[PDB]
Amino acid sequence: GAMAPSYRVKRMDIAKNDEECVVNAANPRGLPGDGVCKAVYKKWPESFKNSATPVGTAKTVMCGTYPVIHAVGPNFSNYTESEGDRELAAAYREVAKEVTRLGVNSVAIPLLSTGVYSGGKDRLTQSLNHLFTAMDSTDADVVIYCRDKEWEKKISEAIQMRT
Numbered sequence: 001g002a003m004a005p006s007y008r009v010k011r012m013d014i015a016k017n018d019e020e021c022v023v024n025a026a027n028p029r030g031l032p033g034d035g036v037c038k039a040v041y042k043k044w045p046e047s048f049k050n051s052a053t054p055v056g057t058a059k060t061v062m063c064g065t066y067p068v069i070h071a072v073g074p075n076f077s078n079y080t081e082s083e084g085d086r087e088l089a090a091a092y093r094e095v096a097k098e099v100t101r102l103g104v105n106s107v108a109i110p111l112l113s114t115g116v117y118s119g120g121k122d123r124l125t126q127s128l129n130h131l132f133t134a135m136d137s138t139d140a141d142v143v144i145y146c147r148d149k150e151w152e153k154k155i156s157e158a159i160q161m162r163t
């Protein structure tokens with residue numbers, strides 16, 4: 001584990017991360033997709049062999065020796081707010097189990113269900129709080145990746161408030 005486990009946020013493409021493993025914001029069918037998923041497909045295409053997994057789960061596939069944890073958040077256009085909330089929390093719990101199983105000291109993670117699966121709603125606080133609930137008990141250094149300047153400031157504020 002990391003000596004003093006921390007949370008950090010960076011505004012840049014997760015495909016350029018400096019961590020020991022990456023979490024993909026995957027679709028259930030293991031398709032190249034859009035946004036984060038498409039960037040992950042371009043950088044680690046080998047990790048999409050048999051990566052299909054249900055909503056609310058995570059499935060890790062190696063690209064060489066680099067782990068890609070495919071985490072499937074719900075698409076809020078299809079689920080109710082209640083059911084989608086439950087599946088989003090479940091996907092993050094499965095990411096924490098995989099990060100622990102892998103023995104990594106750091107992990108790069110995007111905010112699940114905040115892009116095209118958001119159902120047109122701002123889900124920064126919802127998704128980030130489920131990330132914290134799952135990852136708080138792990139000892140890996142967590143680096144959250146985002147692309148929006150206002151989201152970077154809000155995620156950074158939420159991290160600092162708890163310290």
Ligand SMILES: [Cl-]
Pocket residue numbers: 012013016
């Ligand atoms: Cl970039």
Ligand SMILES: [Cl-]
Pocket residue numbers: 025112113114115116117118
């Ligand atoms: Cl998304």
Ligand SMILES: [Cl-]
Pocket residue numbers: 146147148151
């Ligand atoms: Cl963003």
